[PDB]
Amino acid sequence: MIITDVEVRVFRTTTRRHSDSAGHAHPGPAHQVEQAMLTVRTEDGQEGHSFTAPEIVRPHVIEKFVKKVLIGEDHRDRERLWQDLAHWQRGSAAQLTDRTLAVVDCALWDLAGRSLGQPVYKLIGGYRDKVLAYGSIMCGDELEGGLATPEDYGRFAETLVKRGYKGIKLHTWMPPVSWAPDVKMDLKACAAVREAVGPDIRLMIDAFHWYSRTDALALGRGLEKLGFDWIEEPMDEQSLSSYKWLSDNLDIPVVGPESAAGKHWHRAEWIKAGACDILRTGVNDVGGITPALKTMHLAEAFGMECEVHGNTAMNLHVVAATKNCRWYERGLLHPFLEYDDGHDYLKSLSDPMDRDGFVHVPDRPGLGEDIDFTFIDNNRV
Ligand SMILES: [Mg+2]
Secondary structure: OEEEEEEEEEEEEEEEEEEOOOOOEEEEEEEEEEEEEEEEEEOOOOEEEEEEOHHHHOHHHHHHHHHHHHOOOEOOOHHHHHHHHHHHHOOOOOOOOHHHHHHHHHHHHHHHHHHHOOEHHHHHOOOOOEEEEEEEEOOOOOOOOOOOOHHHHHHHHHHHHHHOOOEEEEEOOOOOOOOOOOHHHHHHHHHHHHHHHOOOOEEEEEOOOOOOHHHHHHHHHHHHOOOOOEEEOOOOOOOHHHHHHHHHHOOOOEEEOOOOOOHHHHHHHHHHOOOOOEEEEOHHHHOOHHHHHHHHHHHHHOOOOEEEOOOOHHHHHHHHHOOOOOOEEEEEEOOOOOHHHOOOOEOOOOOOEOOOOEEEOOOOOEOOOOEOHHHHHHOEO
């Protein structure tokens, strides 16, 4: 069960998903994007895999940090290995990130699952085999017929309800969109969606992540008359105090923190200070499945829900293994893209959804990602 190799394979995936200068996703021309796959192998030849961006698992990080911690170690000692990596972050000159911790932890979970022939959520201790998912809409754009106007969001929302989604979350306009951000426009989009889907579909909004306190209050107040389930990260999450203030001034539930650093430790501070009404976590945000589970348990002890940020198997398994999370986040979605088509490097979807809005966790070992190793080999960088 001893780890003998840690390898990274970079390949090209064909996609229409682009990201602007601020990191927001948008649909664009079909192009090839470099993707990396991390593989951990043991003495007996068993392997575990996980995907991430090339820079996160580049040679510098693999040689200086990851191999030194994993090679020659019992792969099942996930807590000891995660803690070893966490301990080296402070002195890593800012290069050993939570993102690197997440991919390594995920590969370790996949390795244990594949080695035992067990789905990761079943190994953790399963709670549910299927879970409701909300359609998470991409940030706004300036594409005619895409997500350029409030009406465009309303029209896309109708399409998502038809698909089966019981919940819908809007990500509104953000720079570099020429005129963004604009609280009034964001509210018009929210109103358009509510008008289009009716009062029975659950709605949420994840607007510009850096609004001032005054703008966030105006946004939240406008959401009141629309009956939205929650307002997500409307202000810079580095300001815990701003969230304590905003929560005390809004009726609508505030969910967070999504992007704030500090992993589960910082999440505890948000609970202690009453900075949110619903907690938030994510495998990529807190450094892996291991710390994500800790954040779920933390929230549960306070009788709170903890909504998991992000799609893909790693997050789906956390959701399936816990009770205090209302949804699995399926997206990001856009009218110009067909999410159900999947990825070219995966033979099947990790998160198939039925016509009733329930995603069914695949009955496959580990994270259950149906990897097309042949495609990856044929498209190596
Ligand atoms: Mg968000």
